[PDB]
Amino acid sequence: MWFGEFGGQYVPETLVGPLKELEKAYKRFKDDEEFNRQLNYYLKTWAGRPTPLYYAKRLTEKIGGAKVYLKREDLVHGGAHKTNNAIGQALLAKLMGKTRLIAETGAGQHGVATAMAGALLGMKVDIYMGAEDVERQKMNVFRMKLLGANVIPVNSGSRTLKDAINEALRDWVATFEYTHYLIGSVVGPHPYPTIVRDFQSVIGREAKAQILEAEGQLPDVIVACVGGGSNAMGIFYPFVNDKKVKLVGVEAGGKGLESGKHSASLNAGQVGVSHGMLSYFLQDEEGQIKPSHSIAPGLDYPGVGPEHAYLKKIQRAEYVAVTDEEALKAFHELSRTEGIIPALESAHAVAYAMKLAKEMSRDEIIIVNLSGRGDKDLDIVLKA
Amino acid sequence: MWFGEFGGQYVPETLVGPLKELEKAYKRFKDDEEFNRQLNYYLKTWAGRPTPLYYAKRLTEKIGGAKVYLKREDLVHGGAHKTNNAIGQALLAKLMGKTRLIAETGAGQHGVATAMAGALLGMKVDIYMGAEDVERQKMNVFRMKLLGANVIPVNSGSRTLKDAINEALRDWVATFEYTHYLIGSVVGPHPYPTIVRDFQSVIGREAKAQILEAEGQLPDVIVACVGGGSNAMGIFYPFVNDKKVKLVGVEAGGKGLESGKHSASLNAGQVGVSHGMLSYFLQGQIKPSHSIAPGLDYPGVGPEHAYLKKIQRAEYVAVTDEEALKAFHELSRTEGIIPALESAHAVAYAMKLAKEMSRDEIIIVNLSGRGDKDLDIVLKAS
Ligand SMILES: Cc1ncc(COP(=O)(O)O)c(CN[C@@H](CO)C(=O)O)c1O
Ligand SMILES: Cc1ncc(COP(=O)(O)O)c(CN[C@@H](CO)C(=O)O)c1O
Ligand code: NA
Ligand code: NA
Ligand code: NA
């Protein structure tokens, strides 16, 4: 339940039962032969795993310091890492006898991933999405509709991701006998932070085998963007006990950390409770969760998962921020230099890795998690 | 040079030297270990090959006949099979000492693939695109620009794909010393039909190993959409000498074969010489095609398909806009895969064919691309 002081299960009594049933089923199926056979079968044949590890040679030589490798989650079916978790949980839900999936989404990538997994397994899918987010994600909303899902616009509160989560929790209270709430990041009440990290850890396990193949040794640094924290936990987790491997999480710096328009929960937030968890949140003086800002629509969650709060506290991982400007610069740079158009979320990680590589030796190795592709962001990049 | 009577190299004398230089370079490099080292390295680590072969269980059960497997070229970097050929030819060009790639594109996928390959290998890229196509492919034009390529609108003729090819040929004639014309399908003068097919044959080589792993036997039928014909040749070619494997190419039937608003060159075209090759073309003058699928816009077809049709090694059919759009929706809802509108033609035909076959028989459908590029077309139609 806990990662030191962070995490927990801060929910009404009506969700204790459902969460207990979920934890029970997860413990039964996580190491089950048939569950893992099916999961790996879908990840391979439908999602296209393993994704490659790409040496960005041109980008590396241009900067003139450390080698930059890219873990290519942009190539997963759906165009982002979210699919890995969507399949895992959707299959778990099917084996628990559930017939319906609900999920929140901000950027729309988790919504699409959930709609895809639901279609694959023959389940109903309703996606809760803040009305502000529906308005700016027309194409992802259309993708979800083509996949057979219904997108439910959320008009309560600030009409954003935090509000979508609140409506989904309210739905799940009444519908849990037949509905699984498919949370999309390492957030929410226990057991969700643990489950989502476990279903994304395939990223790190592949990346470890692939870097040993390419370089014969573990990397010096792993860099990943951090919204709620799932792509970062996925690549980090298999290296946590390799003590010489530095772990760097990159939050959205927005218009700057001192501007009050960013999504850097670990950097600038405070401890608090929301969505069932004790973690870091951007909060005002009256304990209200604040709206976050980022040019990357997927770095929109005002909190961060408790396992990242914990890794920061024990100083196992370092957390930094990169601005909208720096992320954009990286979006263009990677597109031009390596012929890969990254998601704006992922461009934050690329932006930091480029800064860091310049300060490091040519013998050293950085792995960047490229959490998604940039096709979804083309209009945003045009406008900025 | 020829596939039966089809193909050849019917070009002005100014193109003969350049084509002979390309032929010689290709013969040198095609089985060279060093060339193949670099090509396989980029296909694996950058493009993400091999793509999976997926058993569409829900689609199969619903139809109630043959097993339907999908070769997942939708998962290749860039979202379509075009990348396989773009990398192979861009690398060839690089090794020949060229500094610039030019390419035609209609739908914009070959344009993007060429832009990506050029960015990867440090080569200038100019994409010729008919002004009518530039106009309705806003996002692909923008992906190309983000990738560092210049898009040159074509305002001559009908301002579509055939005219882009004409302009690119005029450019290449002048600039071939340092420019490679990176043709996107199995069309044009020898050696292009052969080169493009060879660079797409990885699709079939994977699919063969994958179906032997999954089912312990070769498939009964392979189904692929046919524009110029590259994704179909890619998956077909490694099975040509497996006598019991049926090969089915699916052309764009458009508004219906009787309407004359389609792109079914093999079904309803006439044999003739154009773009340096003897093949089937729609027409007395060659006309622009119609299809809901922007990628099935070439008025002609590759000469190797003309040949397979004539010897009856492959069967060719047509699927309408309406049927393709139905299949786009069906695959999205039933399997959670949004296909390209081009590929949806193959899916549509495969669904018709599977119904008539037994439950132990196997169809492989080539899913040539993903449908993200077609979302606005499908929004307007539906
Ligand atoms: C491509 C990509 N990369 C990174 C992230 C950040 O999330 P993570 O920190 O859980 O990986 C997201 C989040 N996207 C979420 C939240 O808005 C969604 O609902 O789609 C993403 O879409
Ligand atoms: C996804 C997809 N599937 C199929 C085809 C048909 O081409 P083929 O028959 O050469 O495979 C295309 C063609 N696309 C070409 C022609 O317009 C282009 O310039 O982009 C495509 O983009
Ligand atoms: Na792959
Ligand atoms: Na945050
Ligand atoms: Na045609």
Swiss-Prot record, chain A:
PROSITE patterns: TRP_SYNTHASE_BETA. It holds the Pfam family PALP. Its EC number is 4.2.1.20. One of its GO terms (molecular function) is tryptophan synthase activity. It catalyses: (1S,2R)-1-C-(indol-3-yl)glycerol 3-phosphate + L-serine = D-glyceraldehyde 3-phosphate + L-tryptophan + H2O. HAMAP family: Trp_synth_beta. This is Tryptophan synthase beta chain 1. It comes from Pyrococcus furiosus (strain ATCC 43587 / DSM 3638 / JCM 8422 / Vc1).
